[PDB]
Amino acid sequence: IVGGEFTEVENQPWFAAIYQKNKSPPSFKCGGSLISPCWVASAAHCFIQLPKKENYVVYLGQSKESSYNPGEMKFEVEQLILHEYYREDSLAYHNDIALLKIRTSTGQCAQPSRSIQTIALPPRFTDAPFGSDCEITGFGKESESDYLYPKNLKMSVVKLVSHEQCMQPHYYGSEINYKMLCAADPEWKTDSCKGDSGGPLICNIEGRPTLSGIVSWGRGCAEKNKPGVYTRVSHFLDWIQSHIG
Amino acid sequence: VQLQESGGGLVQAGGSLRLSCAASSSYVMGWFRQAPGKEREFVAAISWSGGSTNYADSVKGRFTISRDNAKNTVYLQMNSLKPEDTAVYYCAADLASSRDVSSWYWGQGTQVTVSS
């Protein structure tokens, strides 16, 4: 994340840290969200290159990347489901959404705690009004050209950008569509970045925190007229329910 | 893929040198180096628009990284060089998307030697 602040997972207990195994401790691969005690939602493009589930481990309750967090829960991935109509067109990912069924080494899934909670899915086709504050979090770099990672969870606030603006020529134009949503800071000072993909965009809907977006893509990071682009979760509830449901 | 460096060589301390790298864009471009007895370290990086730039602390204020998106070229301007800067310099490309963890690709490198 560019801008925003270092934060504890208590502020974002649904954040799932997804690591990829090496041949050599696992490397942080991308973010995710705990939508069910046994199910985590992340971005499909995180996994399209090496889609075998054994390549990945999932940690819940992590404020610190690649070190031990008290309260941490470690999970193997028993099901790794990528959206079957996923595609990459231009710089955009379409149907960028993935499901991760998680289980501990003893066969359990997430146990609710201060640092580990589920996030509510939105109602069908329902988003917050455009211009609404939504939070984004993750282990991503603090600028696109930074060599280092902050190694520590970051959280920030962006505003929903209407499809009508976002599809304007000096914004994305037609390389976005209606099953994506844009989010940006009014003066372009904060945004999701390198390492944030798969992570949650949380809006307030019907008086509850709601997974509204999944960090997908965007041109450059916190750049004028170039909002962050997120998988619009409210259009994937049937697909989600066809699996976990 | 194939990033090719050029411009290296022997310079006396306090002198200047300009490294060029040709790529064969949308990615972050950068420069790394490998000093004697050490593994490869980060030197500089720059996003596609020049909007974000970044340097290692040891080269701050006397190295300047630039970019030409027309010719797919990236440059490293090295001023006020010291014996500490003797290394094999590798231009690099971050071939990951703007929301993905960085995945660096390196050239074959070019020798830079600074006298004293």
Residue numbers in the entry:
A (entry chain A): 16 to 37, 37A, 37D, 37E, 38 to 60, 60A, 60B, 60C, ...
B (entry chain B): 2 to 25, 30 to 121
Show the paper's wording.
However, in the presence of an active site binding Camelid-derived antibody fragment (nanobody, Nb22), muPA crystallized with the two β-strands in the chymotrypsin-like antiparallel conformation. One nanobody (Nb22) was identified to inhibit muPA hydrolysis of a small chromogenic substrate and to competitively displace the fluorescent probe p-aminobenzamidine from the S1 specificity pocket of muPA. The 2.3 Å X-ray crystal structure of the complex between the protease domain of muPA and Nb22 revealed that muPA adopts the typical double β-barrel chymotrypsin-like fold. Consistent with the biochemical data, the complementary determining region 3 (CDR3) of Nb22 contacts the active site of muPA. Arg104 of Nb22 docks into the S1 specificity pocket in a substrate-like manner forming polar interactions with residues located on the 180s and 220s loops including the primary specificity-determining residue Asp189. Adjacent to Arg104, Asp105 of Nb22 interacts with His57 and Ser195 of the muPA catalytic machinery. Although we observed minor differences in the conformation of surface-exposed loops between the muPA:Nb22 structure and the substrate-bound human uPA structure (r.m.s.d. of 0.74 Å for 220 Cαs)22, the observation of an intact Ile16-Asp194 salt-bridge in muPA:Nb22 indicated that muPA adopted the substrate-bound conformation. The differences in conformation of the surface-exposed loops between muPA and human uPA may have been caused by the larger exosite interactions of Nb22, but may also reflect differences in crystal contacts between the two structures. Our muPA:Nb22 complex crystal structure represents a substrate-bound well-ordered conformation with the β9- and β12-strands in the chymotrypsin-like conformation, whereas our apo-muPA structure represents a substrate-free disordered conformation with the β9- and β12-strands in the non-chymotrypsin-like conformation.
Plasmin generated by uPA participates in the turnover of extracellular matrix proteins in physiological and pathophysiological tissue remodeling. In uPA, insertion of the N-terminal residue Ile16 into the activation pocket, is stabilized by the formation of a highly conserved salt-bridge between the N-terminal amino group of Ile16 and Asp194. In this study we have solved five crystal structures of the catalytic serine protease domain of muPA in the absence and presence of allosteric molecules and/or substrate-like molecules.
